[PDB]
Design a protein around this ligand. Structure first.
Ligand SMILES: [Mg+2]
Ligand SMILES: [Mg+2]
Ligand SMILES: [Mg+2]
Ligand SMILES: [Mg+2]
Ligand SMILES: [Mg+2]
Ligand SMILES: [Mg+2]
Ligand SMILES: [Mg+2]
Ligand SMILES: [Mg+2]
Ligand SMILES: [Mg+2]
Ligand SMILES: [Mg+2]
Ligand SMILES: [Mg+2]
Ligand SMILES: [Mg+2]
Ligand SMILES: [Mg+2]
Ligand SMILES: [Mg+2]
Ligand SMILES: [Mg+2]
Ligand SMILES: [Mg+2]
Ligand SMILES: [Mg+2]
Ligand SMILES: [Mg+2]
Ligand SMILES: [Mg+2]
Ligand SMILES: [Mg+2]
Ligand SMILES: [Mg+2]
Ligand SMILES: [Mg+2]
Ligand SMILES: [Mg+2]
Lengths: 70, 149
RNA sequence: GCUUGACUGCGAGCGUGACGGCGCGAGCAGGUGCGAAAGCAGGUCAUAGUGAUCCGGUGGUUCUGAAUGGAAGGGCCAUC
RNA sequence: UGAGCCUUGAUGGAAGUGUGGACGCCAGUCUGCAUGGCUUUAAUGUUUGAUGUUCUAACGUUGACCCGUAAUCCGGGUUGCGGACAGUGUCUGGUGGGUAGUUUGACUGGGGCGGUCU
RNA sequence: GUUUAUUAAAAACACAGCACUGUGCAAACACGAAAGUGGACGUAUACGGUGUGACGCCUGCCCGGUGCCGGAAGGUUAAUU
RNA sequence: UUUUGUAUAAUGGGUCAGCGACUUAUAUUCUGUAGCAAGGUUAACCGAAUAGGGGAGCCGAAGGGAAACCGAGUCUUAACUGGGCGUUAAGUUGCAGGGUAUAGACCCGAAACCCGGUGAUCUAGCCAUGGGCAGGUUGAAGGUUGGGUAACACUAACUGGAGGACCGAACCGACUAAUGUUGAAAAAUUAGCGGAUGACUUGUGGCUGGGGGUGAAAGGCCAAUCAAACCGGGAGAUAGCU
RNA sequence: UAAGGUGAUAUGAACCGUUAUAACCGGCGAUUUCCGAAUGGGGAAACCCAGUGUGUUUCGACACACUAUCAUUAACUGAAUCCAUAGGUUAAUGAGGCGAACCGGGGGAACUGAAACAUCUAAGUACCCCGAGGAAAAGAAAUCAACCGAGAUUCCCCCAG
């Protein structure tokens, strides 16, 4: 639902089988929290994968300079 | 797989590893409160200043301490008689003081902790050799002589 | 006894089917076998022993191949 | 405890008496240690896959305490217990009338049973 | 005692009792995409599910089939590399 | 009307009046007719708008072969023969009509499926808070006392007052028969009947929603509707049937 | 603008007007109870109850006026914990609800057809949810072409059933 840093997902899709299922699929990603900011100290964001790995090449700061600004 | 400890802690690295390090291990422990690391351009170069400024010594510091053998060699003969007497021996004690202190007979001063002579000097009056040993990197040469009075 | 006509490419003209299709077939071309030779042989005395299409598999061919040369893939022929 | 590189070994400081592991076509040699004057393969370094140990630091806590607060919620903090487990997301083998969508032929002296569909 | 309001009141449902089975509490199980709630402000003398249906005397043989419970050495076997 | 066949006692219509069913769009092909002719014709658009302009493009004058390719020929085959298909058939664009195609496609009609809302003022459960039960009967446990036991048990009376206890109005329910059956009544009336301090009965308000609820279980109940409620929508569902 | 005129079902009464502020029409205003986003709190909608300020006050009162919630910023206050934050107060802006269709987007059937039915169809249609405009959306090539070149998106006719 979140993965805040990055968008998210929760888009639907149909999970076909052998030929076809007109069913539906959805909810993905995950969560976690408690991220230590070099500054004061951690607010627990509920990012997920692709969100967690993002806080790496990036920052922790710029990775937050948005969930604030905008 | 890329960090910079600097503050080694049982890790296969000291002063910060510049080559493949552990990963995910620092995301929550090492980096937080422990030894921050980000071996990413920015932080990297910034460490060089913390080290390259330590090596400038071999170039600069060595120089501010190597002129020793050069600053003191042409020295005028050290004329510090060590109370030569006793039917052919001496009275003065030749050990550490007269060796080094033989320089401020005009002004300049040194440190008695730089002498280079394994055996104590036989209490003679001859050409007392004094191999000034300021630093391992640079050695110098001094002399000492005793006179009669 | 000798052999491989259970041949390859076509086919006058017919029979029989709503149709898909099925059957008969002299004669022609290339090469065969058997016979001294005329000649006979395009599987079994004849009539049952069978499965359309699609999707594909295998071999053959410069038919095609999305800028061009190839290639994949498609066609065509043979067959599962 | 496996395996990759490959690091040090056995095939392809000067005599004698001895101890150990090696295998046999077997009658034997191999090989460390005192006194005496490249591959077949083993160990250490390792890289990496396995089980199993313990730790805290992600993660859980429907334990306690402190604030927000004269809240049983929630959040922060301290502390305890659990701990790379649990649990979640993606993928994947089970199971799955719990639910869902359907199929379940015709001929026939009614239909059904039987029989037959070329 | 209950039931087909409006053709069936019964021998049917329920019942107390019995038995099997599950559940160590954030219980099993149920409602719910989740949070949360019920179970229960209970905690195995408790709660659930199944069958039998006071009480009396009892409740025999079969584990081949299916299901369930335990084992899991060996065979077969997914994603993955 | 439907049938082999109907005066048929097979179907439909009490009667009258008004309404009531082969349409429409574009595409394709024939026929008639008109224009032009190996040529016919424009589309959108422009526009001094039904003109005129615009020939993008569509069709035909060439066909054969799977195609490259060849071409009144061409495929077939090694074949130069034969055989298949072609070759001195005028087409094309409107207009009106016959048919077809895509559409609701002559008209009327299902039982149903799916989507979103409205419903627990009936009823089924449950929650909270209040109310009701004339009278008469039986008479358990406990106790007091006498007896009696070393002490109890045991017993006798008296007191006591239990119970999904008894009889029976209210109240609740519905076993039987008659009547009603275009009723007084879309389930009742009359005479009997069962329970009636209990798993009782009732007022008020609240909570469970449709594949969902509730259910001492009958597929019962969820507003005279229930093997999946009502309302609106997909919707002119589909109807080889009448 | 003007001789009439006081809306309609019915006059009638009592009247206003004829010159130029009587009507009547058009523009800008003033007023505009209660409910309704409803916003001071509650509420079975048009009702009930309060706090804090006010004027006239025969100086109890009447009514009036403000006081919802979020977001941005401002300043002031401010926990566990020095700090700092969390939180709190105030104030100025702003939002909130309606709305026919077209439009972007999130979620998404089934009847139906296939002369059965699962692939497939119906159709990304119905519907439900969010958002914005006067249009929205798209848009100046990591486009296409074929060795020639064209030159953002959009809409129309062709290519072609
Ligand atoms: Mg025969
Ligand atoms: Mg079923
Ligand atoms: Mg269906
Ligand atoms: Mg039949
Ligand atoms: Mg009874
Ligand atoms: Mg009944
Ligand atoms: Mg009855
Ligand atoms: Mg029974
Ligand atoms: Mg008849
Ligand atoms: Mg008749
Ligand atoms: Mg008429
Ligand atoms: Mg011919
Ligand atoms: Mg009774
Ligand atoms: Mg009767
Ligand atoms: Mg009666
Ligand atoms: Mg009674
Ligand atoms: Mg009620
Ligand atoms: Mg009903
Ligand atoms: Mg439809
Ligand atoms: Mg209809
Ligand atoms: Mg109000
Ligand atoms: Mg209000
Ligand atoms: Mg069908």
């Amino acid at each position: 639902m979140k993965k805040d840093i990055h968008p998210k997902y929760e888009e639907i899709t149909a999970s076909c089988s052998c030929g076809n299922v007109m069913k539906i699929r959805s909810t993905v990603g995950h969560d976690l929290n408690l991220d230590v900011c070099s500054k004061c100290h951690p607010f627990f964001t509920g990012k997920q994968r692709d969100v967690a790995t993002g806080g790496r090449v990036d920052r922790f700061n710029k990775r937050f300079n948005i969930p604030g600004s905008k | 797989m890329q960090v910079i400890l600097l503050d080694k802690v049982a890790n296969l690295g000291s002063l910060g590893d510049q080559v493949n390090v552990k990963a995910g291990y620092a995301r929550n422990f090492l980096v937080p409160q422990g030894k921050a690391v980000p071996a990413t351009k920015k932080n990297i170069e910034f460490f060089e200043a913390r080290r390259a400024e330590l090596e400038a010594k071999l170039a600069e510091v060595l120089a501010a301490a190597n002129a020793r053998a050069e600053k003191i060699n042409a020295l005028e003969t050290v004329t510090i008689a060590s109370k030569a007497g006793d039917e052919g021996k001496l009275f003065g004690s030749i050990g550490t003081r007269d060796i080094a202190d033989a320089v401020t007979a005009a002004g300049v001063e040194v440190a008695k902790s730089e002498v280079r002579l394994p055996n104590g000097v036989l209490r003679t009056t001859g050409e007392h050799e004094v191999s000034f040993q300021v630093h391992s990197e640079v050695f110098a040469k001094v002399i000492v002589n005793v006179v009669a009075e």
